[PDB]
Structure 1
Amino acid sequence: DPGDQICIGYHANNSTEQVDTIMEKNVTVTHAQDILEKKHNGKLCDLDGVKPLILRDCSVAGWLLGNPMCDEFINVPEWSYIVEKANPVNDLCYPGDFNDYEELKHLLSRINHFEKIQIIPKSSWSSHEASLGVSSACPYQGKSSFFRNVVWLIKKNSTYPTIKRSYNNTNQEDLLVLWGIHHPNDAAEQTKLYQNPTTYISVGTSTLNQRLVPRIATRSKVNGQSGRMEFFWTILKPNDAINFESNGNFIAPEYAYKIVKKGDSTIMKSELEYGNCNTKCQTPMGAINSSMPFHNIHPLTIGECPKYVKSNRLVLATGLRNSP
C-alpha cells in the first residue's frame, strides 16, 4: 500500500523577467531587480527648488559684458546651474576675443550668485567722451549701442589726456572686474578716435602687471566691423585696488560683479529651455527622478544622481531559475 511521502521542491511562477550570466543569456527567473534608469522627463528644471540661469540665445561673454540684446540678464538671481546653447547668437556683437575665456567659465562653475555693482560711473569721465562709444554692430531697438557694463571712451576736442584711475575693493567679497582694448583698422582710425598715434593700457593690482598695446591690421568685416575688441578680466580681492592708465583705445569698466555666493554649479550645454519643474538630478537632456543606482541618460549631471553607465540593460537576479 502506498506509503506516506515528503518531497523537497522550489518555487515557480508566471514571471517572464530575464537576466544574463557569463555562460547563458535570457535566463527567465522568478524574481529580478532592474537597477538601470533609462527614462527622463526631457525638461530643464529647478535643482532642489533653485532655478537655473537659462541664458537662452546669449553666451556667457554676452551676459557678463552686457550685450544690449541680453538685457534679460542685467541682474540675475542666484542660480543652481547655468544653461548655454551650443552656438549662442548674442555673443561679442562687436567682434573680438575674450582673454582667458575658458578659465573664466571654469570660475563660473564655482559660483551661484553675482551682485552687479557700479565701480566707475559713466559720468565721472570729464576729459573724455563716454557717451559716444556706440556702434551699429551692437544695436539696441534699432539704434547703435554697446556693451552695457563697459565704457568705450573717445577723444574729446581732438585730445586724449592720460587716464589715471583706481578702484579699491572695499566690499568684503571678491570682485570680478572686466575691461578691454580696441584694435582699430588703420592709423587714420586711430587718430580719428584717440588722437594719439601710439597708445597703451597699463593695468595693475597686487598681482597683475599688464601693459596692452593696440595691434593694427587689416581684417575681414565681422558683423560689419573690421576693428576688434579684446576683453580682459581679473579677480580683485577684498582690500585690494586696481589701477588703470591709458592714452587711448581703452574700454573702461563701468560695472563689476561681486561674487556673493560660491558653491557647486556647472555650465550645461543644451538647446532646451525652462520646463517649469523641480528635480534633484538634472542632465542636459532632461531631469531624473529615480531610486535606481544607475542610469544611462547622459554622463554630465548635477544634483543627487544615479551613477552613469553606458549600458542598455542592468538586471540582477534575485529569485531562481523559472521553469516553463
Structure 2
Amino acid sequence: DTICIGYHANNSTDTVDTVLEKNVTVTHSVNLLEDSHNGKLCKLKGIAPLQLGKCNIAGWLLGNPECDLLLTASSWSYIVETSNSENGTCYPGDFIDYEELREQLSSVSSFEKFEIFPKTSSWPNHETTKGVTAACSYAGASSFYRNLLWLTKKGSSYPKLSKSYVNNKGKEVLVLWGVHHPPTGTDQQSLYQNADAYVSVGSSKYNRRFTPEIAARPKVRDQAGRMNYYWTLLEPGDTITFEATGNLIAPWYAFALNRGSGSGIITSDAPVHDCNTKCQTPHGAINSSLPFQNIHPVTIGECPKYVRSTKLRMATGLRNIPSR
C-alpha cells in the first residue's frame, strides 16, 4: 500500500521568462502588458472629442470659410485633428501664441460662440463690406473669415474707432482679432487712408499696441500683405477696448468659455465612436487596467505606463511538466 506526493500538470502552453531561464512552460499565467487597441477615437470621461474635419484649431476659431459645418460644439474632452486638416490661416500671417491657445482649449465645458461686435451696426463711420479677399475665397468668390471683420476706409476717411465690450457672460470670453500689414505704403492709403495708423487693445490684464509693418515680401496664396492674429481671455466682469485708426481686423464673433482642467490634442485618422475609455492613444482607445502598454507613448487619460517590451507574461501556476 502506497501514497505519493505530486503536482498539477496540464495542456497549457503558456510561457514566461524567468531570470535564470528563458521560455518556461507553466500551467497558468496572467498578462501584465496591454498590446491591443480599439481602432476608434473614444469618449474620454463621458464626453466626446471635438472634431474639426478639414479645418485646424486656427481655421475653426478664425472662421475660415471652409469650416461652415463644424460650427457645432458644446463641450469636449479633447480635440482631434486629422491628416486632412489644413484649412486654417488662409490670409498669410502669424497666429500669436498659437500652441498655447491650442493647449488651453484642449478641453472645455460650456462653450458659446456669440456676436460680440455686430457687423451691420457696430461700425458706422467705416466700411464694413468690401473687406474680402481671394486668399480667403468661398465657392470661387472672394470672401473672408466668418468671425472677423475687415474694416476698411469709408470715402477716403478712417476716423479713430473706439469700440468696447463688457463681459456679462459670467465666464471667460475668448476674443480674437488681427492686424493687417499691407505690402507697400501705396496700399496703406487706398485701404486705411491714415498713413500712420495704429491698433490698440486694452483690458485689465492686457495692454498691447500694434503698428503697421509695411514691407516687400514674397506672395503667399498670392498675397504680399500679411495678417497677424491675436487672442486674449477676458475675465467675467472685465472690459476690452479696441481703439484703431486703420489695419484693424476687428472681432465680429467671440467665444464664451469654461476652460478644462488639462487635456491635449490628438492627431489621428481613426474614426470617432460613441464608446467610452479611460486611456486614449492616436491609433485607438486602450481598454486598460493592466500596469503597462506598448501601443503608444503619447496618450490622454489614465493610462498604463508605456513600455518597449513585447511580452510581460507573469507566471501564476507552476512549471508545466505533463510528461506525455
TM-score higher than 0.5: yes
**Aligned mates of 1:86, 1:200 — CA distance in 2:** 38
Shift of 1:66: 0.4
2: CA distance, partners of 1:291 / 1:206: 47
Deviations 1:190-233 (A, max 9, x none): 01100111111111111111110011121111111111110001
Match of residue 108, structure 2, among 111, 118, 122: 111
Contact 1:112 1:264 in 2 (8 A): no
Distance 2:262 2:286 in 1: 18
Residue 59 of structure 1, CA deviation: 0.7
Q: Structure 1 residue aligned with 2:70, among 70, 73, 85?
A: 73
- Correspondent of 2:124 among 120, 123, 126: 126
2:284 matched residue in structure 1: 286
Q: Is the 8 A contact 2:14 2:26 kept in 1?
A: yes
Deviations for 1:269-307, whole angstroms, at most 9, x for unmatched residues? 113343454444321101223443322111233345433
Deviations 1:222-280 (A, max 9, x none): 11111111000111111110111111000111111100463453211113343454444
Normalised by the size of structure 2, how large is the TM-score?
0.93
State how 1:141-220 maps to structure 2 within 5 Å.
Answer: 141-220=139-218
Counterpart in the other structure of 1:296: 294
Structure that is richer in strand per residue: 1
Amino acid at match of 2:34: E
**Equivalent residue of 2:204, what SS?**
coil
Question: Which residue in 2 is equivalent to 1:314?
Answer: 312
Q: How far apart, CA to CA, are the structure 1 residues paired with 2:163 and 2:123?
A: 10
Partner of 1:62: helix, strand, or coil? helix
| % identity of equivalent residues | 57
Q: In 2, are the aligned partners of 1:174 and 1:235 still within 8 Å (CA)?
A: yes
The letter for the 2-side match of 1:31 is H
Residue in 2 that maps onto 1:41: 38
Supply the distance in 1 between the matched residues of 2:205 and 2:9 (Cα, whole angstroms): 75
Pick from 93, 96, 101 the counterpart of residue 96 of structure 1: 93
The question of whether the paired residues in 1 share the 8 Å contact of 2:53 and 2:84 is answered with no
Question: How far 1:97 moved relative to its partner?
Answer: 1.0
SS at match of 1:102: helix
* 1:79/1:113 contact within 8 Å kept: no
Alignment of 1:4-15 (within 5 A): 4-15=1-12
Aligned Cα RMSD in Å?
A: 1.8
Find the aligned partners of 1:272 and 1:14 in 2 and give their Cα distance.
Answer: 39
Pairing partner for 1:26 from 23, 26, 40: 23
Distance 1:159 1:37 in 2: 67
Offset at 1:87? 6.9
**Which one-letter code corresponds to 1:97 in the other structure?**
D
Which secondary structure does the structure 2 equivalent of 1:68 belong to?
A: coil
Segment of structure 1 superposing worse, 95-104 or 74-83: 74-83
Deviates more, 1:182-191 or 1:33-42: 33-42
Q: Distance in 2 between matches of 1:271 and 1:96?
A: 28
Q: CA, structure 1 residues 102+290, in 2 after alignment: closer, same or farther (shift >3 Å)?
A: closer
Q: TM-score, normalised by structure 1?
A: 0.93
Q: Quote the offset at 1:67 in angstroms.
A: 0.4
Correspondence 1:244-255 to 2 at 5 A: 244-255=242-253
Aligned to 1:235: 233
After TM superposition, the structure 1 stretch with the greater mean CA deviation from structure 2, 104-113 or 92-101, is 104-113
Q: Aligned equivalents of 1:54 and 1:322: distance in 2? A: 51
State how far apart, in whole Å, the 1-side matches of 2:189 and 2:292 are. 64
Q: How many residues align?
A: 321
SS in 1 for 2:20: coil
What one-letter code is carried by the residue in structure 2 that aligns with 1:91?
G
Query: How far apart are the structure 2 equivalents of 1:106 and 1:47?
Result: 17
Q: Distance between the aligned counterparts of 1:229 and 1:86, measured in 2?
A: 25
Alpha-carbon contact 2:281-2:299 (below 8 Å) kept: yes
- 1:107-138 superposed Cα distances (whole Å, 9 cap, x missing partner): 11342442111111101211111122100111
Alignment of 1:17 onto 2:10: no
